[PDB]
């Protein structure tokens, strides 16, 4: 620490003000809030005849009169005031840029298109090409990074991800300490192996512009938020972590009582399905910052699993008291109606939350689940689609499609959907088993076993493996491996000893088949031993087992 | 002229004249149904000529120029199914069907890609 | 004076059906080898 924390304070103070100055609410909010957790330098390139327009442009933007601001800056040669006009021009298009199919779900009303941004993208390329100083060398300044960042985000709109990363990484080399820029970079990954490749780019190819930045900040590893970058990537998708634990500790020492870290730190427990610890880790942050509303829906979600409706309701009452139209506020409420089995109404509130941002966290997916309980099976499936195109990294979105198509007579489309989600979260025990179950319809029994055997290993608890053991024998029965049927079917019999003789219906079929198989093998005495093992179940299995027992004794 | 000489199944003079046309109009007509039309036609001719590589490149550049187009996605999926890149083509077929409702030929192509995905057992 | 859309052609039905038939061929022959 020592001067390292002090050097952060001065430069972080910058990232709070100019970001707020040129109307970036999201980035400035994170940075300024970081001042509080952390334990008036002014300057801009402007002329008096041009400084006036910035005041004109900024206040019109504040009054939310977006479209007038574009006209009033029609001809501006300023390096970065042009950014403000295009930023206003971009958003003016966006609000009316609603796809028709998604809009039907977005509202339920049930009732020039994109060329503007093409002009916008051409304008930004034209301006930079004709601009005096390019990004190369120690030239350029803070405003230039905004242009590239605005160029980068618009590139993502036409799904030009490959070029999008180049623009974003270019923008951040010029200026760091912009949180909003890295948020959009996250959506550029949609894959796991590229992350380490991108990590390799940062460690070797990437370099910072020390001219704008302060001391001990051009270096990548002395930078504090490159840790934040590493935190976000390894929580969206685990993969293989590199220095994840060690770097997390250092950033915890700095930034005391930082709510965002604690929320992220607690969120890790939810990704680890450690619910009991998660509530405690959520509970303190509520006490510290009662009026913080970001990522409270996660707190709702865990409470949904615990079904502490009494606790959840007061949470819903408390949240709605202080604000009633923020996306999390509607999201938590819609979650509440699900606890009351009122699935038909939870759609309405999720619908309200959706219109607020239309690119939220996994709220599209939760909307789809409620449709499933309504047996629509068609709103939900296309609903699950909207989560995919926005965020292709969502496990639940892909899973919902495969799960829903499983109910559909065709299972063929479901295999692909499960395959993608399998890559996203191979650690889940359910997905491998479900994939194998659907893959059995394919008739390629050999590949299902490789999936089936991995499901068992990843299933941890052995008691739940009893049901999947019987599935192994059934598939092996389709092949000339009846011996392999027995060796795995005797395993689930062994698990019954481990499961204190639960003697469920699954092992009832297992026990009778072994007796029949051993009778066919001539082992009457052995088959007679399992004959009395079926002491419970339906009547038909009891009479068949006694028939086997009677037959075995006659042969002795 | 290129479209005609493609119709007559010559596949050579069509390509030459189309390349001449685009090399005339490299500087101008960046958009507005001129560059996209000529480039997609050249790519389709290359596909007919079985030269699929620059076909992939030109179809990709057309797609990045304009995304909302069912034909571009369907043809790129056809190109990928010509090779073995099913993982990168079925998404394109998905998008093409999403953009335009029927796409009967695209439906058949995607269905076949489905039986391929069943048939293949890649890790 | 206005120009209309220049003539452009997409994948026909005959060629895609030829490809579907061929692709059935190489999804059909290989499992015989297996």
UniProtKB/Swiss-Prot annotation, chain A:
TPR repeats lie at residues 145-178, 225-258, 259-292, 293-326, 327-360, 361-394, 395-428, 429-462, 466-499. Its main location: nucleus. The keyword Transcription does not apply. It holds the Pfam family ANAPC8. One of its GO terms (molecular function) is cyclin binding. The APC/C is composed of at least 13 subunits that stay tightly associated throughout the cell cycle: APC1, APC2, APC4, APC5, APC9, APC11, CDC16, CDC23, CDC26, CDC27, DOC1, MND2 and SWM1. CDC23 interacts directly with SWM1 and binds the destruction box (D-box) of the substrate cyclin CLB2. This is Anaphase-promoting complex subunit CDC23. It comes from Saccharomyces cerevisiae (strain ATCC 204508 / S288c) (Baker's yeast). The gene is CDC23.
Curated annotation (Swiss-Prot), chain B:
It comes from the Eukaryota. It is found in: Nucleus. Phosphorylated by CDC28, which is required for the early mitotic activity of the APC/C in its CDC20-bound form. TPR repeats lie at residues 1-27, 33-65, 70-99. Present with 2753 molecules/cell in log phase SD medium. Component of the anaphase promoting complex/cyclosome (APC/C), a cell cycle-regulated E3 ubiquitin-protein ligase complex that controls progression through mitosis and the G1 phase of the cell cycle. The APC/C is thought to confer substrate specificity and, in the presence of ubiquitin-conjugating E2 enzymes, it catalyzes the formation of protein-ubiquitin conjugates that are subsequently degraded by the 26S proteasome. The APC/C is composed of at least 13 subunits that stay tightly associated throughout the cell cycle: APC1, APC2, APC4, APC5, APC9, APC11, CDC16, CDC23, CDC26, CDC27, DOC1, MND2 and SWM1. Interacts with AMA1. Belongs to the APC6/CDC16 family. This is Anaphase-promoting complex subunit CDC16. It comes from Saccharomyces cerevisiae (strain ATCC 204508 / S288c). The chain holds residues 639 to 761 of 840 of the full protein.
Swiss-Prot record, chain C:
The gene is CDC26. It is found in: Nucleus. It comes from Saccharomyces cerevisiae (strain ATCC 204508 / S288c) (Baker's yeast). This is Anaphase-promoting complex subunit CDC26. The chain holds residues 1 to 34 of 124 of the full protein. The modification Phosphoserine is found at residue 12. The APC/C is composed of at least 13 subunits that stay tightly associated throughout the cell cycle: APC1, APC2, APC4, APC5, APC9, APC11, CDC16, CDC23, CDC26, CDC27, DOC1, MND2 and SWM1. CDC26 is required to tether the essential subunits APC9, CDC27 and CDC16 to the complex. Component of the anaphase promoting complex/cyclosome (APC/C), a cell cycle-regulated E3 ubiquitin-protein ligase complex that controls progression through mitosis and the G1 phase of the cell cycle. The APC/C is thought to confer substrate specificity and, in the presence of ubiquitin-conjugating E2 enzymes, it catalyzes the formation of protein-ubiquitin conjugates that are subsequently degraded by the 26S proteasome. Belongs to the CDC26 family.
């Amino acid at each position: 620490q020592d001067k390292i924390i002090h050097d952060i304070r001065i430069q972080l103070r910058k990232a709070a003000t100019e970001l707020s100055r040129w109307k970036l609410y999201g980035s400035s909010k994170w940075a300024a809030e970081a001042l509080a957790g952390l334990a008036p330098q002014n300057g801009f390139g402007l002329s008096e005849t041009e400084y006036d327009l910035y005041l004109l442009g900024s206040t019109l933007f504040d009054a939310k009169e977006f479209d007038r601001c574009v006209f009033f800056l029609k001809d501006v040669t300023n390096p970065y005031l042009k950014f403000l006009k295009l930023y206003s021009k971009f958003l003016s298009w966006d609000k009316k840029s609603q796809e028709s199919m998604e809009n039907i779900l977005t509202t339920g009303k049930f009732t020039e298109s994109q060329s503007n941004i093409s002009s916008i993208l051409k304008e930004i390329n034209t301006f930079l090409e004709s601009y005096e100083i390019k990004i190369d060398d120690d030239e350029a300044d803070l405003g230039l990074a905004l242009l590239y960042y605005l160029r980068g985000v618009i590139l993502k709109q036409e799904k030009n991800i490959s070029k999008a990363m180049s623009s974003f990484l270019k923008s951040l080399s010029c200026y760091s300490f912009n949180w909003s820029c890295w948020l959009e970079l996250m959506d550029c990954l949609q894959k796991v192996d590229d992350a380490l490749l991108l990590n390799n780019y940062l460690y070797q190819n990437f370099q910072f512009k020390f001219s704008e930045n302060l001391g001990s900040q051009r270096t990548i590893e002395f930078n504090i938020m490159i840790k934040f970058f590493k935190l976000k990537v390894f929580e969206e998708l685990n993969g293989q972590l590199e220095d994840y634990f060690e770097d997390l500790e250092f950033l915890l020492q700095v930034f005391p009582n930082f709510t965002f870290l604690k929320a992220y730190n607690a969120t890790i427990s939810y990704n680890n399905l450690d619910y009991v610890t998660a509530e405690s880790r959520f509970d303190d942050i509520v006490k510290q910052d009662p009026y913080r509303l970001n990522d409270l829906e996660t707190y709702s979600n865990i409470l949904y699993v615990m079904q502490k409706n009494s606790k959840l309701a007061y949470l819903a009452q408390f949240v709605s008291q202080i604000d009633r139209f923020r996306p999390e506020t509607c999201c938590i409420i819609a979650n509440y109606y699900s606890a009351r089995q009122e699935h038909e109404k939870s759609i309405m509130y999720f619908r309200r939350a959706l219109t607020l941002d239309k690119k939220t966290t996994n709220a599209w997916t939760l909307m789809g689940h409620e449709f499933v309980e309504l047996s629509n099976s068609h709103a939900a499936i296309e609903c699950y689609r909207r989560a995919v195109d926005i965020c292709p990294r969502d496990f639940k979105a892909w899973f919902g499609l495969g799960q829903a198509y499983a109910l559909l007579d065709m299972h063929l489309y479901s295999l692909y959907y499960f395959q993608k989600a399998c890559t996203l979260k191979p650690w889940d025990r359910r997905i491998w088993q479900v994939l194998g179950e659907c893959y059995s319809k394919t008739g390629n029994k050999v590949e299902a076993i490789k999936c089936y055997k991995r499901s068992i290993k990843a299933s941890q608890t052995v008691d739940q493996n009893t049901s999947i053991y019987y599935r192994l024998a059934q598939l092996y029965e389709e092949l000339e491996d009846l011996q392999e049927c027995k060796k795995f079917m005797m395993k689930c019999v062994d698990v019954e000893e481990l499961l204190e003789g639960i003697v469920t219906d699954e092992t009832v079929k297992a026990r009778l088949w072994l007796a029949i198989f051993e009778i066919k093998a001539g082992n009457y005495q052995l088959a007679y031993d399992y004959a009395m093992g079926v002491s419970s179940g339906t009547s038909q299995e009891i009479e068949e087992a006694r028939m086997l027992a009677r037959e075995c004794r006659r042969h002795m | 002229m290129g479209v005609m000489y493609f119709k007559k199944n010559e596949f050579v003079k069509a390509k030459k004249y189309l390349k001449k046309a685009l090399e005339v109009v490299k500087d101008l007509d960046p958009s507005s149904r001129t560059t996209i039309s000529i480039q997609l036609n050249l790519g389709h001719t290359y596909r007919k000529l079985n030269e699929n590589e620059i076909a992939i490149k030109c179809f990709r550049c057309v797609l990045e120029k304009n995304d909302k187009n069912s034909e571009i996605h369907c043809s790129l999926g056809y190109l990928y199914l010509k090779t073995k890149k099913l993982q990168k083509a079925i998404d394109h077929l998905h998008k093409s069907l999403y953009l335009k409702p029927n796409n009967s030929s695209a439906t058949a192509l995607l269905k076949n890609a489905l039986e391929l995905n069943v048939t293949l057992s890649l890790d | 004076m206005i120009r209309r859309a220049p003539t452009t052609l997409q994948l026909s039905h005959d060629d895609v059906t030829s490809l579907i038939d061929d692709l059935n061929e190489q999804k059909l022959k290989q499992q015989l080898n297996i």
